[PDB]
Amino acid sequence: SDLIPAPPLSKVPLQQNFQDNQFQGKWYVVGLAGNAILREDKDPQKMYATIYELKEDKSYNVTSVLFRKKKCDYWIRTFVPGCQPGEFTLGNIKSYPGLTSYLVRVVSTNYNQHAMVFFKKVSQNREYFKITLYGRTKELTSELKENFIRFSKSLGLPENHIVFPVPIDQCID
Ligand SMILES: *[C@@H]1O[C@H](CO)[C@@H](O[C@@H]2O[C@H](CO)[C@@H](O)[C@H](O)[C@H]2NC(C)=O)[C@H](O)[C@H]1NC(C)=O
DSSP states (O other), X not given: OOOOOOOOGGGSOOOTTOOTTTTOEEEEEEEEEETTOOOOSSSOOBOOEEEEOBOXXXXXXXXXXXXXXXXXXXXXXXXXXXXXXXXXXXXXXXXXXXXXXXXXXXXXXXXSSEEEXXXXXXXXXXXXXXXXXXXXXXXXXXXXXXXXXXXXXXXXXXXXXXXXXXXXXXXXX
C-alpha cells in the first residue's frame, strides 16, 4: 500500500484570526483531495455535508451525512481546540481502533461562502492527509475551485487525487 507523503505542516496555512462561532453551521463538501482520495469514473463520489456545532467547552460537535445505499449515514466527531485558533485534535481518540494521530487545520474561510480545511491522521501507522473545499451552498466559483486545485497540488497531490463530489438533494438538505 503506497502513499503520497503527508506535506510538512509549514506548508499548510492557518486561517488568520479564526472565529469558532462564525464557522458554525452546515458546510457542503464541494471539493475533496487526499493521498487516499481517488477520482473514480464508474461511480463518482456524491456530495455529503458536515455540520459544525460549538459546545460550551468550546469544542465542536462535527457530524456528517452522506447518502450511501438508499439511506443517510451519520457519523459523529468531536474536534478539540488545538494550540492555535483554527487547529483541532480528535476528541476521544482511543475509541477509534488504529488511531494514534489526528489533526484539523482551517486553512482559509470567509465563513459565509467557503472554507478550506486540511486534515491529517495516522491510522494503522499509515499517514493520511486530505483537503476538503467547503461550500455554504452546493456549488461555487471556478476561481474558488481552481484555487483549491492549486493548493492541493502545492501539497503534492496530482489532479488525479482531486475530486468534486456531484451535487445531490438526498440527506444533505
Ligand atoms: C454536542 O453533542 C452532544 C451529543 O453528541 C449533545 O448532547 C445532548 O445534550 C442534550 C441536552 O443536554 C441531551 O438531551 C442529549 O441527550 C445529548 N445527546 C447525546 C447524544 O448525548 C450536545 O447538546 C451538543 N451540543 C450542541 C450545542 O449542539
